[PDB]
Design a protein around this nucleic acid. Structure first.
Ligand SMILES: [Mg+2]
Ligand SMILES: [Mg+2]
Ligand SMILES: [Mg+2]
Length: 1258
DNA sequence: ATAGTTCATAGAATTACCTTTTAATCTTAAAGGACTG
DNA sequence: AGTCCTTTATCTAAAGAACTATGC
């Protein structure tokens, strides 16, 4: 009963962070509030955000200027380009080395250029914000003297002066920014990483540019007239203006030709965000206020011309936009709507609009309602001149048809063949041509099904009622406006306002719809002075006045939509520093005065004390010595981190180098770094080849120095024989493994009490619900990990290790405290499976109680498997174990279907189903829960409410919850049955399946069973590790640890015993084709003994080349068919008896029917016979559900899911999972025969799958 | 009867709101820089 | 010497109802 995974324990390390609540103890909270630390930290969090925004501005300016200045050699770009296109069609090593060379040369030029700048030197050091005496202060000051306002765009920072005060507010807090500076270093890093502007230029934007150039030349080749050069030279002249032509070095500013912008040297104009925006606008165009139609870009011209000549080939030439430059926060060249700030904007602007509509009067001094009703009544009457009023020939006309005639092309076809009874598309079509066209249309076609002009006119005559429909909603809207007219509330986007919001939208929607109905008449002012059409001038006068008034909808609709759908602003939590910028940076004893955070253990409870900055020596040696007592157990923490950095730093430092006294030999080894393979040499020195003797000499010097070190001796290092080391990193591993020690000092309760009472110490209990006195149940895994940190059994040989850089947070009360359930009153139980109908409690229950009050929080990082390195070649070790233990492994295959979120079959090595069940139901013996219904309801809620401007909440969390249950079920199955897990290779449902794969991988990184013993496999100290860390969905491939991924092909409709799958798919087309189809069968004969017909064939002989194999299918069994009279039960053998008797084909003696079948010439015969064959071939029969097989097995048995053995699929879903598991079986066999040193092949092909699945029982 | 299609479909842009995955840095004690005593 | 605040050291690795069509 021992798991085959028993040895897969303590395999590799990983980092985790545990989260707890901090409960202030004693007079701590009152002292905190007495010094105002919390509010100060809120202020500091906002000020910190602002400071990062200012520094970010400085970064942006620097990037812009330095990239403007950069000029890449045209020869470099040309070289890169030639190698880059040669790489297409050829993988030569010479080509990849040359490409690496060119790319790296360009990268080096840029990198060196920005590194040499004056402003880069001071970018990440303290001189930026707190000059010892700042470049930031200087730049801000110049920007003020130059009268240029940087912070105009954002609300939080008013002006430059405020930025000065904010920067100076961090006078002594530069270290507080170190992490941030790291992030900013990633912006300029010369390493190969996506966060670098060098990477963004060379890896991202250069290939995209060269691709756009290729597509452009090719576009001029295939479609020269596709793009209108004069037009883009006019519209985009602004974005086509460049200072320098890098091809000619000419420095004069002018608009460039598209030929010039795609000059390779002119790529030097697209480096920074300004050039990127220009280029991307040349591609995408822009909107301009005061222009009716948008200014077209290249891609628009390509699309339009491709649709003009009806050639989708041009699609391949659509150009890609350049990615943004990093950090750049820049304005768009296209028009940007203004924003409504709060609810008062919404209600007041809406009211203003609808009242402006109500009060407006035309030239004729009639209301818009009366005016439109008059115009459309006169139009219904035929009083107006139909030749002088026109519909826009665009989509609006189509929508008119579909609105009245239910078919969109009716009008367009009608005029189209009206002309027939080289015609280019007109912009407008007069109502005359319409009327005549659809009249002739009704004359040329069946009368009863026809479409009349009076229906159009009746639609336009019915339009005016929409105003009446709008009035009532307008007044109740007035009520809502009374509700929301408050100036700064901004709570209209709270979910609680849903109803209201919907109402608002409804109103707008109505009006919006109205506008579009009238849009068909409106004549946009797009300027073409060629032809002005003669029109009824009065009709269009009053109309265009009304429509111009109603067109104010679209800005209003956009502004309201953009405000309402915003994500609500919730304060969330902020970092508590307790006046210390290095608060939780490290737990080491020697760093206590600096980091001021200390851990205690009292009784079975844990505590975090934070020393007040003023008195940080509260716990120094003297104080622990004279306060030694039985109150609290203080943790003393010793760590030697980054040995590869720490040892040279300490031993070769200017301070102590004389003390450690390294020989000139060791100095040499260090200078040329001969002790390392790829280590960094000392600056100014040349890296020299690795020498094992130098390595071991350096290791000996390290041992001597450690034993000479005043402090580090205390670690009690036990080092391997230095001759055993083949590389310095094995020594460093032993150093870091043993350089971590946790011991405790006992401190009197009276001293702790006095030092908290004095406000010198801030004491918190580290708490989660498992530390309550009432908690009798299994604790959270994170509670077990936390406790394991300080456990003796862990301290003797450390697996759980405490990390520095913890953080503390404060979360304000988010929700008003509401007592949902008063005490002593019975509460209805939600689970219908619950034996207990209701429950009563002695105490109150408050919904979301934790959010009803302010709270303190502790995020503590830890390292698991501290003494193991990271995962390396994990799949190979898994596969070794599985090959060794192949006899015992089960296959747990998981499929997804319409009926189940996840369905699984457990199978053995022989193909027998041990277990088959659904993951829909999760529960104990007492209760159970079905998540399928709940998930369905979620998916409905999304799509429905999405059109209500209603907030969707926590659907992904609701899915991941369920999944978090099923990963536990799977883990249990896997350990219990020595199983590997097999998934199908891989819209929303699919995403749930993928999320299950990812969360299962992560679960199996570190697998602890709560009931297992602390020191035994599966327990806290010995956790199964059955997968490596998740990387990315693409990188899952075919195997992640004990999880494998197989193609899903042909797992649905296939016989479990014979592996038969229907590839015939016969359809009736003609008598000739039917005779040809039935002639190709080998033998169609009747079995007297068995009592059914038999069709024997070879898939080779039929149309599709892919199919193969000999088969004999039988008419045996029942079948189910659905039809519009419900479903009925058909017996194809009897049906065939009827058909053959009707045509006097004699099957009674068991003769062969093929020739007879092919001899008939009647359509009904072959139609019905092909139908019978089709129903026979139908394995999946669903009542309006079971699986059946037309192929007999060795025993002459036909598989029937309705009555089937335990080890066979009992339904179709289980059949799909079962075949997933059969592909898993193939994988197991390959794993079993895999040889050492040879790569394992996990790709399954349909041929291999069909051969295996057909021959396993045959 | 009955036997099949549609409730319009789709492309190229721009703006806005919302959402997601993915990829980087760190999860440190102690030397150094200044200054004070 | 004592302190506070900042900078430093640098390995390993590889659907369902309605409409359309007569094919029943
Ligand atoms: Mg430049
Ligand atoms: Mg529990
Ligand atoms: Mg809940």
């Amino acid at each position: 009963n021992a798991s085959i995974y028993q040895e897969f324990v303590n395999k590799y390390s990983l980092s985790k962070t545990l989260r707890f609540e901090l409960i202030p103890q004693g007079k701590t909270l009152e002292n905190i509030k007495a010094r105002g630390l919390i509010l100060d930290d809120e202020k500091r969090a906002k000020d910190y955000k602002k400071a990062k925004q200012i520094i970010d501005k400085y970064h942006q300016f620097f990037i812009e200027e330095i990239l403007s200045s950069v000029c890449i050699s045209e020869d470099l770009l040309q070289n890169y380009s030639d190698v880059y296109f040669k790489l297409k069609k050829s993988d030569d090593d010479n080509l990849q080395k040359d490409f690496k060379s060119a790319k790296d040369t360009i990268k080096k030029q840029i990198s060196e250029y920005i590194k040499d700048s004056e402003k880069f030197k001071n970018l990440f050091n303290q001189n930026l914000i707190d000059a010892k005496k700042s470049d930031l202060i200087l730049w801000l000051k110049q920007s003020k003297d130059n009268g240029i306002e940087l912070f105009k765009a954002n609300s939080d920072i008013t002006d430059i002066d405020e930025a000065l005060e904010i920067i100076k507010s961090f006078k002594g807090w530069t270290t507080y920014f170190k992490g941030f500076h790291e992030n900013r270093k990633n912006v300029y890093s010369s390493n190969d990483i996506p966060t670098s502007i060098i990477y963004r230029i060379v890896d991202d934007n250069l290939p995209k540019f060269l691709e756009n150039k290729a597509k452009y030349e090719s576009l001029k080749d295939k479609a020269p007239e596709a793009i209108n050069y004069e037009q883009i030279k006019k519209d985009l002249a602004e974005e086509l203006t460049f200072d320098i032509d890098y091809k000619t070095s000419e420095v004069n500013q002018r608009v460039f030709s598209l030929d010039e912008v795609f000059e390779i040297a002119n790529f030097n104009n697209y480096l920074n965000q300004s050039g990127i925006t220009k280029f991307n606008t040349i591609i995408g165009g822009k909107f301009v206020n005061g222009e009716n139609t948008k200014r077209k870009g290249i891609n628009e011209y390509i699309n339009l011309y491709s649709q003009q000549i009806n050639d989708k080939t041009l699609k391949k030439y659509k150009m890609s936009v350049l990615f943004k430059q990093i950090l750049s926060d820049t304005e768009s060249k296209s028009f940007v709507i203004d924003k409504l700030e709060d609810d008062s904007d919404v209600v007041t602007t809406m009211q203003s609009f609808y009242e402006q509509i109500a009060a407006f009067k035309t030239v004729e001094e009639k209301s818009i309602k009366e005016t439109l009703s008059l115009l459309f009544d006169d139009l219904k009457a035929q009083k107006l001149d139909l030749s002088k009023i026109y519909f826009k020939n665009d989509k609006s006309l189509t929508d008119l048809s579909q609105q009245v005639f239910d078919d969109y092309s009716v009008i367009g076809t009608a005029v189209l063949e009206y002309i027939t009874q080289k015609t280019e598309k007109a912009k407008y079509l007069s109502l005359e041509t319409i009327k005549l066209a659809l009249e002739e249309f009704n004359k040329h076609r069946d009368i009863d099904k026809q479409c009349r002009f009076e229906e159009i006119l009746a639609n336009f005559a019915a339009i005016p009622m929409i105003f009446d429909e709008i009035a009532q909603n307008k007044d109740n809207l007035a009520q809502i406006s009374i509700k929301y007219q408050n100036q700064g509330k901004k709570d209209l986007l709270q979910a609680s306002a849903e109803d209201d919001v919907k109402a608002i939208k409804d109103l707008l929607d109505q009006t919006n719809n109205l506008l579009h109905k009238l849009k068909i008449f409106h004549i946009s002012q797009s300027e073409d002075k060629a032809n002005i059409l003669d029109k009824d001038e009065h009709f269009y006068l009053v109309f265009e006045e009304c429509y111009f008034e109603l067109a104010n909808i679209v800005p209003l609709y956009n502004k309201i939509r953009n405000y309402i759908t915003q994500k609500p602003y919730s304060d969330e939590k902020f970092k508590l520093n307790f006046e210390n910028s290095t608060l939780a940076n490290g737990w080491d004893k020697n760093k206590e005065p600096d980091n001021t955070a200390i851990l205690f253990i009292k009784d079975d409870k844990y505590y975090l004390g934070v020393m007040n900055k003023k008195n940080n020596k509260i716990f120094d040696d003297k104080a622990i010595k004279e306060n030694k007592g039985e109150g609290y157990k203080k943790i003393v923490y010793k760590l030697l981190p980054g040995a590869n950095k720490m040892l040279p730093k300490v031993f070769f430092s200017a301070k102590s180098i004389k003390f450690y006294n390294p020989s000139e030999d060791i100095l040499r080894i260090r200078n040329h770094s001969t002790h390392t393979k790829n280590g960094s040499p000392q600056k100014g020195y040349e890296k020299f080849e690795f020498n094992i003797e130098d390595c071991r000499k350096f290791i000996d010097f390290y041992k001597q120095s450690i034993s000479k070190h005043p402090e580090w001796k205390d670690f009690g290092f036990r080092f391997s024989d230095t001759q055993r080391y083949n590389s310095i990193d094995e020594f460093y591993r032993e150093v870091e493994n043993q350089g971590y020690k946790l011991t405790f000092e006992n401190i009197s309760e009276s001293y702790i009490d006095s030092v908290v009472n004095q406000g010198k110490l801030y004491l918190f209990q580290i708490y989660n619900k498992d530390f309550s006195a009432y908690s009798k149940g299994r604790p959270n895994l994170h509670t077990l990990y936390w406790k394991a940190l300080f456990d003796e059994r862990n301290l003797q040989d450390v697996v759980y290790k405490l990390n520095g850089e913890a953080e503390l947070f404060y979360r304000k009360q988010s929700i008003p405290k509401k007592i949902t359930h008063p005490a002593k009153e019975a509460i209805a139980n939600k689970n219908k499976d619950n034996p207990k109908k209701e429950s009563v409690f002695e105490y109150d229950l408050i919904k979301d109680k934790r959010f009803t009050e302010d709270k303190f929080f502790f995020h503590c990082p830890i390292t698991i498997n501290f003494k193991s390195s990271g995962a390396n070649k994990f799949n190979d070790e898994i596969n070794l174990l599985l090959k060794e233990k192949a006899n015992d492994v089960h296959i747990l295959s998981i499929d997804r279907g319409e009926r189940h979120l996840a369905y699984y079959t457990l199978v053995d090595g022989k193909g027998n189903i041990i277990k088959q069940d659904t993951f829909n139901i999760i529960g104990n013996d007492r209760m159970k829960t079905n998540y399928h219904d709940k998930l369905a309801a979620i998916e409905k809620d999304r799509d429905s409410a999405r059109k209500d401007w209603k907030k969707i909440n926590n659907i992904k969390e609701m899915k991941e919850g369920y999944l978090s249950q099923v990963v536990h079920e799977i883990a249990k199955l896997v350990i219990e049955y020595n199983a590997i897990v097999v998934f199908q290779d891989l819209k929303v449902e699919k995403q749930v399946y993928q999320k299950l794969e990812k969360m299962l991988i992560e679960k199996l990184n570190y697998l602890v069973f709560k009931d297992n013993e602390f020191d035994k496999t599966g327990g806290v100290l010995r956790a199964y590790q059955l997968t490596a860390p998740f990387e990315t969905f693409k990188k899952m491939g075919k195997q992640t640890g004990i999880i494998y991924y197989v193609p899903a092909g042909f797992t649905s409709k296939i016989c479990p015993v014979t592996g038969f799958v229907n590839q015939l798919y016969p359809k009736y087309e003609s008598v000739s084709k039917s005779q040809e189809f039935f002639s190709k069968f080998d033998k169609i004969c009747y079995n007297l003994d068995k009592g059914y017909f038999e069709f024997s064939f070879d898939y080779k002989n039929f149309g599709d080349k892919a199919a193969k194999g000999k088969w004999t299918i039988a008419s045996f069994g029942s079948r189910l068919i659905n039809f519009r009279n419900d479903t009925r039960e058909v017996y194809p053998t009897k049906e065939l008896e009827k058909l053959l008797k009707d045509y006097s084909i004699e099957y009674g003696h068991g003769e062969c029917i093929k020739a007879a079948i092919c001899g008939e010439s009647d359509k009904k015969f072959f139609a019905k016979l092909t139908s019978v064959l089709n129903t026979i071939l139908q394995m999946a029969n669903s009542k309006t559900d079971y699986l059946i097989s037309p192929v007999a097995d060795v025993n002459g048995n036909f598989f029937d899911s309705r009555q089937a053995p335990k080890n066979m699929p009992q339904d179709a879903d289980a059949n799909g999972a079962y075949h997933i598991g059969l592909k898993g079986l193939m994988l197991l066999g390959r794993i079993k025969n895999n040889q050492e040193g040879k790569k394992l092949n996990l790709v399954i092909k349909n041929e291999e799958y069909f051969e295996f699945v057909q021959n396993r029982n045959n």
